[PDB]
UniProtKB/Swiss-Prot annotation, chain A:
The chain holds residues 722 to 729 of 729 of the full protein. It comes from Homo sapiens (Human). Interacts (via extracellular domain region) with trypsin. Belongs to the major facilitator superfamily. Proton-dependent oligopeptide transporter (POT/PTR) (TC 2.A.17) family. Proton-coupled amino-acid transporter that transports oligopeptides of 2 to 4 amino acids with a preference for dipeptides. Transports neutral and anionic dipeptides with a proton to peptide stoichiometry of 2:1 or 3:1. In kidney, involved in the absorption of circulating di- and tripeptides from the glomerular filtrate. Can also transport beta-lactam antibiotics, such as the aminocephalosporin cefadroxil, and other antiviral and anticancer drugs. Transports the dipeptide-like aminopeptidase inhibitor bestatin. Also able to transport carnosine. It is found in: Apical cell membrane; Cytoplasmic vesicle, Phagosome membrane; Cell membrane. It comes from the Eukaryota. Expressed in kidney. Not detected in intestine. Highly expressed in macrophages. This is Solute carrier family 15 member 2. The extracellular domain (ECD) region specifically binds trypsin.
UniProtKB/Swiss-Prot annotation, chain B:
It is found in: Membrane; Cell membrane. Expression is limited to epithelial cells. Expressed in the kidney (brush border of proximal tubule), pancreas, liver, and small intestine. Expressed at a lower level in the adrenal cortex, testis and stomach. Overexpressed in breast, renal and lung carcinomas. The PDZ 2 and 3 domains seem to be involved in the interaction with SLC26A3. Interacts with PDZK1IP1 and ABCC2. Interacts (via PDZ domains 1 and 3) with SCARB1 (C-terminal domain). Forms a heterodimeric complex with NHERF1. Interacts with AKAP2, BCR, CFTR, SLC22A12, SLC22A4, SLC22A5, NHERF2 and SLC17A1. Component of a complex, composed of PDZK1, SYNGAP1, KLHL17 and NMDA receptors. Interacts (via PDZ1 domain) directly with KLHL17; the interaction is important for integrity of actin cytoskeleton structures in neurons. Interacts (via the first PDZ domain) with PTGIR (via non-isoprenylated C-terminus). This is Na(+)/H(+) exchange regulatory cofactor NHE-RF3. It comes from Homo sapiens. The modification Phosphothreonine is found at residue 80. Residues 7-86 form the PDZ domain. A scaffold protein that connects plasma membrane proteins and regulatory components, regulating their surface expression in epithelial cells apical domains. May be involved in the coordination of a diverse range of regulatory processes for ion transport and second messenger cascades. In complex with NHERF1, may cluster proteins that are functionally dependent in a mutual fashion and modulate the trafficking and the activity of the associated membrane proteins. May play a role in the cellular mechanisms associated with multidrug resistance through its interaction with ABCC2 and PDZK1IP1. Belongs to the NHER family.
Length: 8, 86
């Protein structure tokens, strides 16, 4: 369960 | 859920739009996480786990996560989102 995250 | 979509227009602040866009490797779609209290996403009506359907009227359901990020990062001083909850 690899999660990508980006602060926007 | 597309049976109850939501339209939200965000005004960019000093810390950006005040949310994280997340995706799960291997699963379609992008979703909202970590809405910052009092930030643009909060004020615009976004909720945790909302799924993005359109960015400025463009359907992004089939687009890769990195492209959805780029659309939001490139929008300028504001961005309009069609999302749905759950």
């Amino acid at each position: 369960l690899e999660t990508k995250k980006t602060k926007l | 859920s597309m049976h109850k979509p939501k339209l939200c227009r965000l005004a960019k602040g000093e810390n950006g739009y005040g949310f994280h866009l997340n995706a799960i490797r291997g699963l379609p779609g992008s979703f909202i996480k970590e809405v910052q209290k009092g930030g643009p996403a909060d004020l615009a009506g976004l909720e945790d786990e909302d799924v993005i359907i359109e960015v400025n009227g463009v359907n992004v359901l089939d687009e890769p996560y990195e492209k959805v990020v780029d659309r939001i990062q490139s929008s300028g001083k504001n961005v309009t989102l069609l999302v749905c909850g759950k």
